Design a protein around this ligand. Sequence first.
Ligand SMILES: Nc1ncnc2c1ncn2[C@@H]1O[C@H](COP(=O)(O)OP(=O)(O)O)[C@@H](O)[C@H]1O
Ligand SMILES: Nc1ncnc2c1ncn2[C@@H]1O[C@H](COP(=O)(O)OP(=O)(O)O)[C@@H](O)[C@H]1O
Ligand SMILES: [Mg+2]
Ligand SMILES: [Mg+2]
Lengths: 478, 480, 51, 72, 145, 72
Amino acid sequence: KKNLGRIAQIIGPVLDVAFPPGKMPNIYNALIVKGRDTAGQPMNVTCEVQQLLGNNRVRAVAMSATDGLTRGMEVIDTGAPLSVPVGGATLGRIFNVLGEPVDNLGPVDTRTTSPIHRSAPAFTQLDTKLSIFETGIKVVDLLAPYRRGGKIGLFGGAGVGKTVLIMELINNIAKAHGGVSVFGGVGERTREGNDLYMEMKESGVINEQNIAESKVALVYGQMNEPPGARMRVGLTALTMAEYFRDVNEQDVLLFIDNIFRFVQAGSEVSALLGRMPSAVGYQPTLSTEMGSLQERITSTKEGSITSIQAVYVPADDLTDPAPATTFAHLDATTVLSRGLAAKGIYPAVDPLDSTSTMLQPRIVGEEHYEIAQRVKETLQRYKELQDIIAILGLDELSEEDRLTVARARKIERFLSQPFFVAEVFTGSPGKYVGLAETIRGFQLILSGELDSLPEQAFYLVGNIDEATAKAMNLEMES
Amino acid sequence: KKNLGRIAQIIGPVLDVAFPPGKMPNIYNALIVKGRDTAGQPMNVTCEVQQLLGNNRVRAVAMSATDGLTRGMEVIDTGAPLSVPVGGATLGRIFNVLGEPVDNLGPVDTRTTSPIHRSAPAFTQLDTKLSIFETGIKVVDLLAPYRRGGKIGLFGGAGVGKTVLIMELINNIAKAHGGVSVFGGVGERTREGNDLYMEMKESGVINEQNIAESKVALVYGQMNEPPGARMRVGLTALTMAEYFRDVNEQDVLLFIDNIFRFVQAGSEVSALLGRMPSAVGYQPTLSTEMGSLQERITSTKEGSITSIQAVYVPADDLTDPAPATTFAHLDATTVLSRGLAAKGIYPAVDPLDSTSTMLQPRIVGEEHYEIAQRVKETLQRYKELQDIIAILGLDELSEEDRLTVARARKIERFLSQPFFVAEVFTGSPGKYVGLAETIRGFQLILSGELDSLPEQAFYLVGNIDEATAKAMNLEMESKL
Amino acid sequence: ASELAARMTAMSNATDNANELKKTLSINYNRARQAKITGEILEIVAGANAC
Amino acid sequence: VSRVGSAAQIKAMKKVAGKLKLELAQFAELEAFAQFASDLDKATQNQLARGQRLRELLKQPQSAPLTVEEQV
Amino acid sequence: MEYTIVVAETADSPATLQYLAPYTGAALAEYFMYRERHTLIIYDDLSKQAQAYRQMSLLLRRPPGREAYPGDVFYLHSRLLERAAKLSSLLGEGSMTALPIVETQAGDVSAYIPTNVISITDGQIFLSADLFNAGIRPAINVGIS
Amino acid sequence: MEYTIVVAETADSPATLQYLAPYTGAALAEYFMYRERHTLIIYDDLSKQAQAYRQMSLLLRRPPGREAYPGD
Ligand SMILES: Nc1ncnc2c1ncn2[C@@H]1O[C@H](COP(=O)(O)OP(=O)(O)O)[C@@H](O)[C@H]1O
Ligand SMILES: Nc1ncnc2c1ncn2[C@@H]1O[C@H](COP(=O)(O)OP(=O)(O)O)[C@@H](O)[C@H]1O
Ligand SMILES: [Mg+2]
Ligand SMILES: [Mg+2]
């Protein structure tokens, strides 16, 4: 005997639903429109109450296409927020925003479901253990080491390598991970989700037979989806991540590509809700919508989520409010560059604009910390000299400033690395580089014992030994 | 107080007050709201009528904090604008916007009051005399001489030195000034308001033993005030400074810090008064407000007002419409640079952008004028060269251009000066420098008779005798 | 003559690096010029509707 | 910028560091100008030495504070 | 023109028909995709669809963003270009190669409309104007493409 | 922590509580300032107080100003 609504208005994906005066749905509750098409009757238009409007009327945002909805259809209030299946039944499965399987398999076991709107963990239940986390990448392990159990951001514009670098952090880590990984695809290419679903199966992670032993749950709301769906994809993936943290008490990896598209979709429907926008046309509730996602990610004293997010940066502008509101939530930010990707240095990580909480001597060690400083002191000094050498060139620099230019020109190429994922672009095989290899490889450039080698010997080699073996062939071949 | 109104809306500092249909307050009248405090006692909160709205209700901006007010409280209309007590009874006293004494002494005698809104003097009443007064400052007395009876701006961003310069003008001028001084603190720090009060006392200008034998009236409208109060602080201070001019017939100093906050406080309430924003988020009445206030500050035939006022320039952007409106009203703009303050050259007066209408040979003579041009020609020449000495170095210059570089290094240091008020920043005692000592010193740097001294000999010295005697100490300590 | 032609080579490369610089500074100015005007009016048209 | 100045210090610090702000500000002008000349004289070359020693005084490790004794 | 449909809007045409026409031409291309054929769709100026939808929504008094384009500008071109796909063998293996064309202003790849489509598209072919003026037709900048 | 109060509003909280967190802290500081104690208060991110106040005033439908911040 649920209360029954009628649709009053349809403006895009935003529906205004007229309810009886005694009973109104609460904010964030899900509504099921009856729905109708040419062939059949789909109840697959799920809504979500945003605003109570008055005159016994709510304002809801649809999670599907609203084409084919008529003013005056029956709307069913579910009485609860949007619930999603969680647990071991979600392992190996691709989901909608609505928690519904897309992978053309059997229906999921919905004995255990969970709402997508939950409060964050309490201040008491947090853990303060600062463990380092190794990724196999030379820019990442040296100059911005990642937080085991914390938020991590990959910043950069279009076509710089956020997706290729995030597929390297799945490749190096998620198979070596002792727990469940969760991928959340928010506003990305549906082709890229097809490749990841094949990369998981080919790597043995999503096994075709005995699918309940898979340790990856995929959640996809991509570019084609309506903007109300793409707001709630990240909350569907996060609800499934925080089941394994709270109930199964496992360490969880949470890859979300892209969380900018989570913001951009919340900006599009905020225009339809009639709200007064903030700077750059963004929604006024931007820091609260963004913080409602990121404060549910933090690790508890039961389990631990590590999230690696790709944050798209519009127009290469890190001062844009949607990149800027993300920086406050992150333990490590890996800013990718376009000027480095235009050179072909990959991963195109800006080594000075990429930061970390972890790069402190009580965490990384004293040997690691004193060399991460000396790389950044070298690349800062060469950053300052690129107005003198922009016009006059190298010829007018002093003996010391030419030596800092010479070493920093070798540091920048040894920061680059071939990836396993990028073996279909270049053909060269990727190299995992351990941190013990990374610290000693930059000890040699800063001590100057490899000043005789050419600079192209350091480009796209794993160890510093491969930079030595490449230096032979450039010196040998005549 | 026969008109009773009721509050219809409270949105921020702006009220809507509804009145009986025939009888309504005129614009700029003072509505006194019979509010109540946290105890339930009666507390008066004064508002000012901005616009009649129709349907027998006005829109009023409050001069106090509106938190605690209720839709439905009685609002009386006094039938008049804000009357402010003026006269000799207001000397050495600290006032609100409303003329109420802040400084925890006796009640002020309100037998002589003047309303805060009035018209500027007519075109017939303006005086024609173009006179210079001496400030003790080397950049000011050489390159932007201040007009007696004139309107002076100090332009610059936060932290370049507008307040230390205006505290130095109070130190140099207001002691030997013949008439009354009036400081209007508009939208600034209460520490700096308190700091000034102590400064008056140690200099004997508040004269705390025999009050109203003093020579200053202080009005403060500081940052913690609501924007309704900040709009009118300038007006209250000027209503005081116009009584001493008109009735008492004497020359008045009117220091205003800050005249940007008059413009900013109107901008905070303009969108709540219902106005569409003008360029850069400012009220569409920016230049009429600046104009209303500035026009009142003028020297007439009966008395004189010399206004020395700081203008805040947000983000060091002089193209902002709040400083850009102010430049037209002034007789000497003293633009302060942050490039010069980052070098430690203080007072950080940009001599190429600070100008005066008094720097004419018919006013200062041709000895002052010919060296004030040769200093500005030397520093303009060095401003053009800083690009190519950064790229190509000092060695590419001609020996004529290495010479005008080396003198402009030494002029720029010698424009700097230790202040009496800046002894806790310079670390060295301050210096009053006369105009003849200023003219004599820059004639020596330009001629080339001081080409042997190092450039740091001219840094923070008063006289040119102090620059050479500093150079003798730098030659002795070079041997040591 | 070798010194004065090394300098002529250096001042040729400096004046052509400064040409390539001046072009991309004129393009990056016009982007910032146009974005300033677009952002300035959209603050004004927002305030013109909000009253 | 500190808008209180040496009133916010003890007498010992004011006697020593009373001019240190404007000396480093004037040094940092002339260090940037000393890169523009090839052969510079000793009265500049002394002040470029003293200015680079006054910069080395001011560097600290994190959360290892200096007492006011150790600062004077 | 025995295997080509031309969907033609002009500049004299209204902004809605220029906003509409890529979705028309994509749905012509989906009739053959889901009938096991292979298809090739070209959009000449996705740049000019973005400015016609901007024209529409500023006349609709909708709050815009960067360069006065609205928020639905990404979803404009990603409804369109996610319809281009090599289909699986369970559907008959139709394909749709989409070649959109985006015009840049003095090579501004950081501009809002080129940067939205680069984040949708699988690759890009940079035609540069230094090469076209030098007679290096086709002016394909090989290293950046 | 023997002499420190920590007032914490994290970004999961609504904007009204982030707006009032410095006034919650400063009213605590004025308790000790007026009882003859000396107090230090750090507001870690005043810029985030203004963005919480921008959100409140734009959902109250107040007319915005520069960067859609309200005039006050
Ligand atoms: N490590 C790499 N080696 C070679 N090419 C790369 C590498 N990383 C990225 N790229 C190039 O950049 C292109 C776009 O990168 P992508 O991950 O799509 O960027 P974004 O995530 O910003 O969209 C890739 O198609 C690839 O050609
Ligand atoms: N004449 C001066 N001598 C030395 N330092 C100065 C001088 N003027 C300003 N300063 C420095 O600038 C700081 C701020 O200047 P202030 O007068 O407060 O300018 P504003 O009112 O624009 O902020 C002062 O605290 C002082 O450190
Ligand atoms: Mg990508
Ligand atoms: Mg000031």
